[PDB]
Design a protein around this ligand. Structure first.
Ligand SMILES: Nc1ncnc2c1ncn2[C@@H]1O[C@H](COP(=O)(O)OP(=O)(O)O)[C@@H](O)[C@H]1O
Ligand SMILES: [Mn+2]
Length: 245
């Protein structure tokens, strides 16, 4: 498959001179994946694949220029490598490769649902097989930092305001989307002017058996993280705020 990869990297214009990008692409992505990107390119969603944003155990994220709804947009292209407790029990999904495709769709559906409810996530564009295209959060091809990446710089912001933004978003996600993120933490919240939630393939509906326990986990993480910055919050008060009690 090595020859196919290099062949698609060539068709995608991912050049040697583009830093370490080509070698990262060729290692983290396979042929069938590149075929999909090229087909998304041919369909007109992707104009130019850009730099590598994140390489992970489950997913790889890249920058691209593309077009959505008639206009040029900056995109995060998230690609799942070709889970269980988070699928089973979520009856929306009628239950190794087909499963990565379902998770991809799940994240997409979760973004759309969260988006429609007024939660701050990246506007979802499209998905195909293991590739998801969404709004790039950041500027000049530089992603907005997650809250862990902000770090001590959080001390020079209105941390209490950021905390309340986070809470408002969880409240909307629960009350209006009827979802629970289930991996909400400082690693999965970005910030530029406002918070954005990301990473939502595992999000579940309020019908999921574990939804409440997931939510309480999410709430504790947020309380724990923000306590390091002098935000005083109570588990009981935050939980009842989210759930509308
Ligand atoms: N829409 C986006 N815009 C800009 N950067 C993004 C976007 N989505 C994800 N990223 C970057 O990629 C990183 C990993 O994405 P994430 O969805 O958290 O997957 P994982 O936890 O599997 O690596 C995020 O921490 C962020 O740094
Ligand atoms: Mn993540």
């Amino acid at each position: 498959d090595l020859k196919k990869i290099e062949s698609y990297l060539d068709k995608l214009r991912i050049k040697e001179k583009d830093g370490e990008e080509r070698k990262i692409y060729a290692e983290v992505l396979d042929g069938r994946t590149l075929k999909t990107l090229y087909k998304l390119s041919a369909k007109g969603y992707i104009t130019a694949m850009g730099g590598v944003i994140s390489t992970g155990k489950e997913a790889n994220v890249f920058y691209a220029d593309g077009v959505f709804d008639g206009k040029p947009v900056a995109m995060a292209v998230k690609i799942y490598r070709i889970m269980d407790e988070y699928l089973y029990g979520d009856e929306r999904f009628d239950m190794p490769k087909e499963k990565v495709f379902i998770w991809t769709e799940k994240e997409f559906r979760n973004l759309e649902r969260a988006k429609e409810a007024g939660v701050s996530v990246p506007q979802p564009y499209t998905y195909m097989k293991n590739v998801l295209l969404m709004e790039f959060i950041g500027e000049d091809e530089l992603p907005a930092p997650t809250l862990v990446e902000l770090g001590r710089e959080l001390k020079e912001l209105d941390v209490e305001g950021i905390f309340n933004d986070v809470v408002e978003n969880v409240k909307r996600l629960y009350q209006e989307a009827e979802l629970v993120h289930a991996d909400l933490s400082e690693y999965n919240i970005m910030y530029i002017d406002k918070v954005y939630f990301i990473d939502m393939g595992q999000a579940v509906t309020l019908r999921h058996p574990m939804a409440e326990s997931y939510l309480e986990r999410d709430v504790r993480n947020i309380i724990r993280f923000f306590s390091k910055y002098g935000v005083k919050a109570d588990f009981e008060e935050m939980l009842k705020e989210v759930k509308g009690e």
